[PDB]
Amino acid sequence: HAGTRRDFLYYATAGAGAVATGAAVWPLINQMNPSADVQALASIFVDVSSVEPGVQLTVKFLGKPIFIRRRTEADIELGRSVQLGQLVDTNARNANIDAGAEATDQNRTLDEAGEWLVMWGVCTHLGCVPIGGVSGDFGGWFCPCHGSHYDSAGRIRKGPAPENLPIPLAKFIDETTIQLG
Amino acid sequence: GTRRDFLYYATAGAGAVATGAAVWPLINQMNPSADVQALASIFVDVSSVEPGVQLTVKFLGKPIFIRRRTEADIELGRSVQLGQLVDTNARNANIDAGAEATDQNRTLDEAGEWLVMWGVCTHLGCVPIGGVSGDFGGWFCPCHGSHYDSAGRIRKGPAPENLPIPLAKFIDETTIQLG
Amino acid sequence: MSGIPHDHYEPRTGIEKWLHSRLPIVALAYDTIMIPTPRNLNWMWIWGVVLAFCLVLQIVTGIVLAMHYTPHVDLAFASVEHIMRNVNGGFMLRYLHANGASLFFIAVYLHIFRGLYYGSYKAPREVTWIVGMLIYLAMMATAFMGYVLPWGQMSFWGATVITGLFGAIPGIGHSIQTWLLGGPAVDNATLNRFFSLHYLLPFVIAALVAIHIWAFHSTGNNNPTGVEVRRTSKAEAQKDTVPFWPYFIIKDVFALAVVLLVFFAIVGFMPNYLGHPDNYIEANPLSTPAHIVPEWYFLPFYAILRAFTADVWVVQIANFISFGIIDAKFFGVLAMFGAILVMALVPWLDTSPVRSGRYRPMFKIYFWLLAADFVILTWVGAQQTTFPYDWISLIASAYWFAYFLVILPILGAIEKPVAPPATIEEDFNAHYS
Amino acid sequence: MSGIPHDHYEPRTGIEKWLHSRLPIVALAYDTIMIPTPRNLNWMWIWGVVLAFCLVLQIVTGIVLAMHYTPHVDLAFASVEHIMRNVNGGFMLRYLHANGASLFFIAVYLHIFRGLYYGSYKAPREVTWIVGMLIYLAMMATAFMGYVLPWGQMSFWGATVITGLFGAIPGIGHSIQTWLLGGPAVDNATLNRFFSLHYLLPFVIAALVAIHIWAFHSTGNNNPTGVEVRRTSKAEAQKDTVPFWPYFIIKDVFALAVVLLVFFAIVGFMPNYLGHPDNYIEANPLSTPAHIVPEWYFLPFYAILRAFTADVWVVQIANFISFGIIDAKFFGVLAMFGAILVMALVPWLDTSPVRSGRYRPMFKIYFWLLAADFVILTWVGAQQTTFPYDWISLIASAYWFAYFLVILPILGAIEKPVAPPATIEEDFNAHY
Amino acid sequence: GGHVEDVPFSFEGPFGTFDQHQLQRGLQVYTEVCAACHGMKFVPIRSLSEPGGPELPEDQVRAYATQFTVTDEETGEDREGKPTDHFPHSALENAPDLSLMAKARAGFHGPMGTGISQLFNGIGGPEYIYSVLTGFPEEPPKCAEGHEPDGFYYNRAFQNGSVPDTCKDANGVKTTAGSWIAMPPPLMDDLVEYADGHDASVHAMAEDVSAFLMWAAEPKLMARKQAGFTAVMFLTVLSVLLYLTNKRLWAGVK
Amino acid sequence: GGHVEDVPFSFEGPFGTFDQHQLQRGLQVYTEVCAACHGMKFVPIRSLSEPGGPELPEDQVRAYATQFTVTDEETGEDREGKPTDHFPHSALENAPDLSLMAKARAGFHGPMGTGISQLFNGIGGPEYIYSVLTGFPEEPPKCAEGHEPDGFYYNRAFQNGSVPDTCKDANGVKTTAGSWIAMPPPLMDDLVEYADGHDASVHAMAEDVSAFLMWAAEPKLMARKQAGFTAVMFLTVLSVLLYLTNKRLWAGVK
Amino acid sequence: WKYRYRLGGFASGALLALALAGIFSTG
Amino acid sequence: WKYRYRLGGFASGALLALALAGIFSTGNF
Ligand code: HEM
Ligand code: HEM
Ligand code: HEM
Ligand code: HEM
Ligand code: FES
Ligand code: FES
């Protein structure tokens, strides 16, 4: 009851020093968070009428490639051939459709005819571009960095990637274009 | 015997050359790189101006002045005797190295209308402020207060030398080559 | 200092009197350089000096290269070509820095496996081992960030892969990846911060090296017998030891003059052999190369990363029991770091009282299996992730963990050691009779 | 440790004993913080802690700023505006680093003038003085090259003038100048190498600070009386001293806190007052501004440089007797460096046996003249070269040299000093 | 510039803040008048929406940006402005960039080189800008009544300009307070139609645009002052606690 | 890079050097042929006079330089090229820049990923360049004659190209040694006249450009060989003297 | 009981810094 | 006298390193 005022004071000055340190340290961490690059909103559209069947197209957005492909008949056929229970990831990653759909080549194509597939060209494992040209055992794309295989719908079939290649907010709008962003 | 320390100094010796040859490249990398060496020669030609005003042109990272002087500044009575300058050399690449700091030896033309110079203070390299600044006409260096007269000759302050005149010549009466 | 009986410094000349009475820096220098050292150290003890050279080679070439490099994505690769092409000796200075990193990492693996064999991690030396691990961690980070700076294809895609690893960490990981990148993707903010950190961390490495050197002066050096120097008297200590100057300085400087003779032969006549040719292609954020290989010293851990996939049974078990929080991605990230951590924990995992592996007849087998396994992990990291390389990668990754977590704890119970010689003097006189 | 009778560290916790038997890091830390310190120290002893603070601040903010700056002559200025404008807290971080350099030079000028007054450079302390001079020279180079990095008009024309100084050295000077520039003019080669060296030299300063701390630990601290701590016994040493932790740590941290209250007030409410508006103009190699004025901490040396024009009688003599090898340009460069050289030599120029200046009744006058003269040199540095400022700057420079080269050697031969106290204990008791 | 007019601006002093509507008025004045000659290469257009500035809605900033068109890095060709673009460079090469002009100019000096005037009055940047804008008199100084330059205009605040030799002195330096500037007198009463029905006199517009150019030079002045108060409060509390701890501690040494 | 023909270039091995004449021939072929599409944006034109390269005289390098049109990096005006300029960028948009191609490609591999083949044979970039240039056959592979991609040409060396579905094996595996490349067969017999009357076969021209492209990728290869030898000699002497010193010291304790 | 004042002191100092730097600066 | 064995050692070591690097600069093995 005597050295209680000393201890209270010595700990109060320690606590004020702690707060005065915390405020002094956080800006040195926070400066590494995004600065000008918070400008993630943008818009683009592309002339899809260039693309012949079996041809893969790329465009940039958000610092990353977006694929477009005019799918081949055989790419649609082997696409449909998969029963949902064979997939590593059963969920159709498509922000254009409502969340929680199933990956069955119908929730993963931009128009109902099944001709068009649009994706981030970005492997869901660790971000490398998966190489197309019907590469991989499953005839879709092959991730060169860790050996991750995608099929002709962009569904993950083998390797360390957790999920199907994500599909952004893309609608043709014109018979010769697709709009993105 | 002493042939011990002959060997011990020989091994010490192979060391200080190998290390001495290792240290020189870490210095020599700061000497001018081959691009900077290539910029040491340039060719250019530049055009006419009205009297009583000056131009400026970049070369070798630094300004070239071109002033067409006023009647008061082409003449100045030629009043400055060679014995009252700080620097008595012409500092002129177009004439001999024994030239004096005379008005006509400074100018490019015969009348003394045209004065071409490096815009670089001979003290420590600041640009002399022109117009008719300073207390001797001519220019004033803002960095340490050296004064140049209407002929670009050093009159007061820390600078040792008259403003150097580059290699330059008229091509037409309207234009002047620098390289 | 070390507990070994020794002569202290005495200042001889008047200037030594004048200085020593003011600042005992010559005393500290003498007391460091004159440390009594076991007579029987073999050629595996050179590597500490070679590492102390590599650190200076990298610092002085780096400081020089930083006078000419530009840390901006529009200018970086062009500035490296400017170094190679216009700067006096700039081609040599670049190849020296780039190959010198490989020299730094081969010297650390020889230094580490020396320690793992002769038991230099055992008590009282656990602190020296821990500081060594912190040094090695700082080297790994330093070299990765350095390899991003030239901004070729391999720089960009390596940075892309490796920043993704932090995105694997459940919950917090996307925030950490974004804070590393400074944005949603590898970009100019990443290059500029990696340049500043590549400048900083060599000084951290140096400051840890000073502590590590202290860590080994406070205990004294180990030796191939594992038998300590006799502290009993100066006479017995001198029978076990010689001063580090000149005997071992000249021995280690000789070995350094040979290892640099081969290093300068590589840098002169084949400097691109360790490199990956795709890093002479400018970074193309829209086109990943046909094979991303991290440079050779990272391959064993990159092998351990690739070894674990959702097809693997222990991954399926971890996935189940974690309710899918441990997916194969995060499992592989945990495995890759865990392989380094478990090497840090070796002072507590080896239960055996005998220090030198020389006298541990069963341990010798598992050690040489580990030594070969590190080579296999390095080589298998370069191959494609198809049969049989998936099996070879998995089995090698398994043995790495089995050595530290199982074999070492069991051997200290089961093994029947040979008896060491009575003292270092006996061993030395047995070889050099 | 220091030769004051003291208790050594003693490990007692299980972990303490496990560690101390392996690496005596806690013992070294304990000896460092527990050093017995003279109990009579006044407020002038705080500046060492403020200097350590400034070094830590300038390093941490520099490392952070170097993540966003670009050392290239087409992006440097733009990247500084990016820091000011887009980075989280970047405006404050940059104003902290820029004003922190002023805080750092203030704290070293007060730390130096303390050492000059109380004789802290005298035997046995000449080594800590010399290491202090190396620290100061490294600060001067570090801050100059830092101020080149924004690539504004002041950055460019400062880099021009200062590299021009090396060209003044007879014969070899042109080689050193072109080696510093990397070329015939200030350009991208200069900026990029000055960036690398500005990154490097703070760590050099740090290693010198570690040696400086070791040196004064090896002697023990000076005190306002200049009489040493009684080495005879623990009992006497404890009367002259008190342990550094907590008593002086808390005193110094208190003083630091109240000093930084003003520092953060400046950085918040008037961060541009100490700077130059002209460095917010992009560098232009074709025209020098009309306000060429160094940062303020270089102004005394810039004043000494400007004082020696070719009409100055000593310059004329030197030019004659050197047969033209010395001229007003090179004389000015030699004088501007002599001003620091002669201060480094003060341990040997001061012939007096008495340590502390407070017992030196004539020395007090010339010391306060020197402190005023250093203020005058700072102020004349900002003025134009016309009359009367040419006279004032010349007289001031002459007094700076006369103090070290004439007055200090004479006073120790002629001064009639007062008698200092018998002990630090006596002085402390007399003041309570 | 000497003898600048000490204009009271709401951002002055430690509690000072920008008037958002004065900033929007200054933006209008810049856009309609000054932007014809001058540019602002360091200002991102998106910053017009951000806190402490004009704080325009982002769709208005997007409409505003669309008035510009720029040689886009990937088209290589003229492309309408987007909020991520900066303001364009000065269209007249003679006209200085205004992104930092309110920091790159001092209005207050001395006395006698001591810097005390700046210590109380501040640097004086936007005051200098206002003084130059208001600085064109109706009549030249009459020293060169028949003799002044043709391509230049007398301004009483501007100091760096040309001077007629009849106004010049050798004995002194210069008769006149000002000098001749290349910028034509940019403002006229009601030149800009303020949709608020605010005062559109030369005086009012000159203040409004000087405040806008102050925000252009220091868009985070508000946050800087807030951080100043926060840090001062932390160090005040901690200074008092440290003082009392020191006193209690040294009272033992007594 | 596909498995190459092992061309015995004169620069190979520690004593190998560039033949100045072969470099001049390769430069001629690049000038007449490749510069239509491929740039050398990292190569400064002045390097053509540099020691250990083609070592053209300076006025001839200047004459060469003026054939290019350069958009001046400061003036914006187009002008004749100067020795201080670089070679142009690739005129054809998808043609790779050749400044580094002799380092950016490997011709030798393994076995079994061990890298020992590169240890004996080197990286093999020049041999790859030669193999591509020599790799166009007179007619396609016999498989899939009905399915060749339009605008592409079969090349025996190229491995990154497209392949017809009919030429893939069922695993998605390439049956052909080569693949289809967008580069049309560039060399043709006697396409370039060597004024000395040297062999103008496609093999000669392909070798000459491969040597020139090696010099373009490493202009200082010669200086690197010499620095190698001089360092090796210093460290040999120092090694021997240290060895003898060590032996003398350690003899004294056993 | 122990820590009655140690913990209480620490939070009393920490909170006061957080309070008086926030509210009076903001309002 | 004694010092020329030391200094002659130093010089011999010096010239031998330089001379051998000179020889290889003739490039003829
Ligand atoms: C632990 C010591 C260091 C290691 C292991 C290391 C490693 C590396 C590596 C592997 C590279 C890539 C080289 C390449 O493939 O092109 C690199 C590049 C670079 N390093 Fe370091 N480094 C070290 C110290 C330093 C220091 C102190 C600096 C000083 C700034 C530095 C400056 C640079 C620069 C500027 C580059 C980019 C230019 C280049 O590629 O040469 N390094 N570093
Ligand atoms: C910058 C890199 C390093 C340097 C410069 C360095 C330096 C040294 C030196 C000079 C020695 C004494 C000579 C010798 O035994 O070879 C030594 C010993 C040692 N090092 Fe390191 N080291 C480094 C990294 C490491 C690493 C990565 C480890 C392991 C994780 C490590 C662990 C040890 C151990 C256990 C010893 C033996 C200590 C003893 O015998 O008491 N060091 N080190
Ligand atoms: C002894 C400690 C230091 C001193 C005295 C110092 C001094 C300075 C000064 C006076 C400036 C000019 C600021 C201005 O007026 O705009 C500056 C800028 C700069 N400093 Fe330092 N500095 C120190 C440490 C560091 C370190 C260690 C780094 C690197 C990690 C660094 C990075 C920078 C950078 C990048 C700039 C330019 C960007 C800017 O203006 O903020 N500083 N420094
Ligand atoms: C990085 C800048 C510096 C730091 C961090 C630093 C640090 C210190 C510290 C902590 C002390 C002990 C406490 C005190 O006396 O205030 C001290 C004392 C001292 N310093 Fe410094 N110092 C620096 C620069 C200098 C300079 C520039 C000089 C003079 C050239 C100098 C000369 C001295 C002297 C003579 C003492 C007294 C030693 C004694 O009392 O025995 N230091 N310094
Ligand atoms: S990065 Fe895509 S497979 Fe790993
Ligand atoms: S630089 Fe011209 S007077 Fe000093």
Residue numbers in the entry:
A (entry chain E): 7 to 187
B (entry chain A): 9 to 187
C (entry chain B): 1 to 433
D (entry chain F): 1 to 432
E (entry chain G), F (entry chain C): 25 to 278
G (entry chain H): 79 to 105
H (entry chain D): 79 to 107
Q: Could you give the paper's own sentences about this structure?
A:
The simplest cyt bc1 complexes, such as the bacterial complexes from Rhodobacter capsulatus or Paracoccus denitrificans, comprise three subunits: cyt b, which binds two b-type hemes (bL and bH) one quinol and one quinone; cyt c1 that binds one c-type heme; and the Rieske subunit that binds a two-iron two-sulfur cluster (FeS). Following successful purification of active complex, we used cryogenic electron microscopy (cryo-EM) to determine the structure of the four-subunit R. sphaeroides cyt bc1 at 2.9 Å resolution, revealing the position of the TMH of SIV and providing insights into its function.
After fitting a ubiquinone-10 molecule and truncating the isoprene tail to fit the density, we found that the quinone/quinol was bound within the Qo site. Therefore, the quinone conformation is likely to represent a snapshot of quinone approach to, or egress from, the Qo site rather than the enzyme-substrate complex. A hydrogen bond between the Qo quinone and His152 in the Rieske head domain locks it in the b-position with the FeS cluster close to the Qo site. Twelve lipids were modeled into the map, all of which were identified by their characteristic fork-shaped density.
